[PDB]
Amino acid sequence: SEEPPFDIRALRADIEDMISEKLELGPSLIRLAWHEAASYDCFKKDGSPNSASMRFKPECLYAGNKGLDIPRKALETLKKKYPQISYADLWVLAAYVAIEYMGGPTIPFCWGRVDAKDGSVCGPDGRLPDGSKTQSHVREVFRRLGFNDQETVALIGAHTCGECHIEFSGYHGPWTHRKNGFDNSFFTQLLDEDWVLNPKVEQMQLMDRATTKLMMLPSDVCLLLDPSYRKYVELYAKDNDRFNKDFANAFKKLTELGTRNLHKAPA
């Protein structure tokens, strides 16, 4: 489909330069595209997902979006060099590049996302999920977004990369030992390890009995306790390829919620 008004070929490359110069920016780019989309209520059809509306207060000030000012600022260096691309397209693409760069699937990109002009269109607070809660909450949040239990488990598989930071979320640590890689090793960490309480972190989180260097959230481990979710956990933990297929589709679907009139990018 149509050729975009910015140089995506150069852009894809420059984004990798930024990530290679700062690997912890990789996982952080995924979170930024995802919480931008998460405000969506599909039943109410509001929230204004995928419009880079987290540029403006209050959505940028929401408790669930703490520390996301870092990837946003990082992408400013590239908004200047490529004025033709919207913030919305750039957050999404920076995230596709981050996932591919880290060993994940290559997602077909689509462009045409209109930016929110000001923070008058933001969604209400409380749309973002709480890691302290479990599957009833999780299933409530992903239902509202428009995902089924399968897509729900796949999307959370992204915790295969990155880590929690006390000063951001109150939680702490990586989910896996390869926190800059992107595969199914989250469903594998979840299934193989013995998740004991971490008594030294005030917000309740888990840790592996084997090394105690890794961590899990109540919202992460609720994927075990729910029978539906555990089916898909076993599935993705054994089938890395299917995880890549399913993550790619869902994250694409996610980052296209509330969007119309997009165009397939060439490669």
Ligand code: HEM
């Ligand atoms: C119920 C669902 C989810 C909950 C409760 C949750 C919770 C959290 C928390 C507490 C953090 C720590 C933030 C920090 O302090 O750095 C985090 C980070 C992160 N989240 Fe999730 N998350 C959920 C689903 C997802 C999904 C669907 C994605 C993407 C597809 C995702 C991607 C990430 C990534 C990549 C990081 C690492 C960020 C970094 O290392 O800087 N999460 N999440």
Ligand SMILES: [Ca+2]
């Ligand atoms: Ca939003």
Ligand SMILES: [K+]
């Ligand atoms: K990894």
